[model samples]
Target: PDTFIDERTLEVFSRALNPTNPMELRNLWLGRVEAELGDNALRPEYADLWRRSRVRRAVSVEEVLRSTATVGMVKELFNAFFRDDLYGALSSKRNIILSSGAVDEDEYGLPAALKETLRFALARNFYGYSDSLGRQPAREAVAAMESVSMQQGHYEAASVALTMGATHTISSLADFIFRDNPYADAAICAIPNYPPLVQSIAWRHPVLLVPTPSHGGTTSLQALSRAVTPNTPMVLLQTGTNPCGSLVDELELERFIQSTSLSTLIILDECHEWLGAPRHFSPARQRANVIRVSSLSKNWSVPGLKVGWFLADPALVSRYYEFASTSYGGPQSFVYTLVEVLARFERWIIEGRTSIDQQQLREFSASYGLQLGSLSQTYEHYVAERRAREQVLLGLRGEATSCLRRASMIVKTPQCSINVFAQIPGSEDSYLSFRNVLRETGVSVYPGILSFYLAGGGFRVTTARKWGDLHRGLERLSAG
Candidate 1:
């Protein structure tokens, strides 16, 4: 602490930790201390120190575990799982593993087939330079996998290029698609998408958000069509959104695509589409300009395997291959081995495990008070369940919801995925006040305002925990 935190910051931190200090005052002092520490400063004690200093009230490990967003990429998860200092603190608090997007490791053991597949890969011992575009066998396997469920035109192996994960795929996609276009200065995106997808585009171009309906995935086609102009070069839409499970309406999306110029690129994130069941239509297949992205990390529950890919026009695919070759020396050879195996066992690994997870979710919900009618694999059914749960939460909030609404702050219960979004009543400070109140009750959440490129005070709760944990967190929220 002496070396990591400067003397003045230490004084503020000490004051913040004093038992006699008011909670709000402690929070204030701690904030000052952390502001000095900055994000780059790292130490073993810093984890515990920041956790203690950041909040006005004590947050037990149960809440931290329950309140996490499950859809984060794998590397970020490493810090949460393997970091010695952080893990020590978490263990001391008896934390459960609820934060990850994949199922609990103990409960959702790696598929036996995947284990065998890895062994097969290791056994090959045939280390050689894999193609920059990806090995032909693995690419063929992906095409075969896509053909089974997605009706988007036949995915030719030649049109597929591998990446480390969705993030890499998206970054390369943004660069390849937007950097060269004469009209690539502006884009339209759906709000509340995976922040990286939005950020990847926004880093290089100005973006407008198409606010989704309170109960559906995509905004109306008319609104999206209106947002586009001659200067706009692309639009980003997620088939199954992160944090929440919003899905684009295929028919409406097709119409929207038909209306746009051929120069306008449509990027589709299909990360969560395979969460529950197979889909009949893929928007990418229907449009030539559409680029489709997916990864083995998510529904496959093999994030450590580190394999993701994108399907696009043959020319774009070739360009990405060249980009990958120069940028990062192409996808690792071991990844090709893993992808080949994953593609071969795609059905057993994806469908079998996802079915089990859904069944567990239903069973857990039934056992707890959080059940919202009958759970089903359909998007409509998921939305209905979320709506039902939202009513229950709003009812439980009593006057709190009314007060926020009176202040013109809308708190939308998400439709498909596991997030709750809120608009604060007054200034940005009011948003902090609101978030602090919830944090005091041992719940944690994200600021949704950043995910959208719009004006408003926004925050989010990731309700991705088990039913029992969610109920406890919600109960505390209602009590507050």
Candidate 2:
């Protein structure tokens, strides 16, 4: 069996052991792993050998089963390392998850007001059946927030129907479309989006995928016009996309919606929209045929609370409420506790919170000698940084470098989203070789193939981590 600890690994861990604070330990561990292994450290031979040498770590069946309930290839990669049994017996305290579409647990500490409010709610022992469409207080809170969020409050504040979380809302909405739109022949989806959204449509109906440009450009209405047919009954596209938090051009979308056959329905996933900036336009707010879906997961930075809802015309909400009541009673009391948090800390969350988070992340990166500055100055910042890094990596490589360049040329420019997608040149094996090298260094980016079968095998790097951690992971790829 292979067993060895390179000097690089030793030097990295030497500093890690000195941090006595738990938070400091976590930051140091991630930092040291990134420094020594580049970005791919989890699966690197040396790291694997070191983990295995520590002694068996027994992981429970529930823990193993619980972790598998997510999307993408990165989870499979995680499974491989866990199955190898290299690390000491699986202790819950020893593991940390640095990848995924969700926010980090430590990113926003719960505000003092929220903590006190929750303690009072628990003390009152008020666990009872709320409305099937959500507690009136929660719905009103969400509804008012939406008005402030979009700058258009034409709809009733009572119309918001809170679900368990975004996933529950999305899955139910997909089922509703399939059940309600029997006459619909096909579903059209704009690509480089979340996969489950596509799958939800695919399971019941045919799908027409519209792949956006690869070189960081917009999805043109002209392109979508060409894809839609007379038989197309519904269209699924995100208001703000995953991987690259870019919003679709509103004018273009408005024009396309107007031009499309009047009978067709449009479902806009607005999960990432609130993270970028305030908006004045929404298809759901403007058109009766549209259903706008969103969640507090990203906006509130509380995925653990699992709160999500949709906004549409009152008539449509009435129909959805009926359908929802048959299966589920609505969000629980604990969810209302979170809504209180949103109500109390509205301004901090809406205006300054995201920028505040990004600022802190930039400072964290500076400590590691990586000068990744403000990520929110404009769209150009993300585009410029990615292009500069890609150019350097491409310049240093051989024939494969040109292949990567060609692949990259097709992708749209980086947007205001949480993920950055890049095309990996060479065959699948070649891409895997490159990807694994980084994974060994402590980073696990998503493969493009997992998101889009047609993306031709690229990779998706998440910006959800502290900027310093994100920089350390990507730095390995740029230098490699």
Candidate 3:
């Protein structure tokens, strides 16, 4: 009660806690107060101080959680399984993990026999260093796939460069964008988005986080047009955005691009594009200014594999290739080869090719001695497997959305990604409710803060978990 917060510092705290106000940093309030009221300054009782000082309504746990910076990564805190904390470990066997990155292998795992073939090929001769731009065949294959091409000569080989992984590609691209100027102008990222990309960009360069009005993950194009200048270096966006399951409208994006400075680089994270039961083509195909990125992590169900790539115009490819050559020579021979094979496989699957008519696959497989008979057999099995899996996924999404609606929670069904974005109607601290739900039923969930949803506090629930666990977890979520 003895300490006092000046009106200026108090105003900052007010905006920080407002659900509708987007934040510049993950926890900017604490950092601000530290400068104004040093640790050495005499203090007031925190519980009493918040009520008297920063209160609009009651002081919330969200405010308290943001009261400290650099405390714990949200993932580690929520999933701190077996820790000394009172809540059951996030990894508790009974816990229904709605956290991102957990896929139900029962429905998604690769054929063990095919995986064995990949391993044997690597052991036989694919261990050597590859071209810095990745192997020729892999690039050509991915290029064709993204461009939605089928003819042999239609590949855009030079415009593709395989990277180590999606995260690395993102990180590398961020550095590449900001490198020319040590003090570059702030970059713009639309939210809710992949958390790492936002933080990693904010890690070094300044970032302006723009809020998207829809849960469909479309950008604020009108506002974006006003903010982007000839000097703005980069802009990050998504199609089938992570966690939210939203996709940008391609035509609208193209219109926005024309009105902006050509100097600005637009990066489209297309990781989720290939996810819809009916996949879509890369909108970046004709747009030279746009750089499209995707990986085999999800659709191919090989998150452990480090193979991913980007597609850009041939002119942009030269600089991109030069940069890649210097930073990391290339993915190993085996990694690119696996992608090369899968790229071809994915193309065939999407085209709905059958043994009754697949001469191209036969000819291609012959080059590497891959079993032709098995390709046809496995292809048929996987095509059927995917349809069944989609129905199961659709059902699970229905259950969770219905539960959230009953509780008066606001949620939008994502179009492609395997996660759901749900809002807490008037939550002062969605994380606190998450903790309570987690404790009551051992079901772990991710907070919106992690995904940069500062305008509203909510949760990102993964639909890719075991059916029994998700069903039980949803029940407990509503109960608590």
Which lDDT values do the candidates have, in the order given? 0.52, 0.51, 0.61
Please provide, for model 2 over 252-296, each residue's C-alpha lDDT reduced to its tens digit, 9 standing for 90 to 100: 777777776656767777777643334767443457767778776
Each model's TM-score?
A: 0.62, 0.63, 0.78
Model 1 stretches astray by more than 4 angstroms = 1-106, 126-128, 216-219, 276-278, 282-284, 347-434, 453-459, 463-475
Candidate 1 structure quality by residue, lDDT tens digits, 69-97: 21121112223323532344323342333
Worst 10 residues of 3 by lDDT: 1-10
How big is the RMSD of model 1? 14.2
Q: Give the alpha carbon lDDT tens digit for every residue of 1-480 in model 3.
A: 001123433353454455333332223432332233344212233223333444454434334233322122332333332242234323456667776554676666665434755886677787887777887877878876765652223448888978877778888888766777533666777655665666566655666655554534453466566767777778887766666676666566667777666677888787776445234443433466777777767765677777788877788777777778788876767766567666776677667675424566553545566555776776676567666766766777777778878967778766675778776666534444455556666777776645644334567888777777777877877777
In terms of lDDT, the best-performing candidate is: 3
- Descending-TM-score candidate ranking: 3, 2, 1
Per-residue error for 188 in candidate 2, Å, reads: 1.6
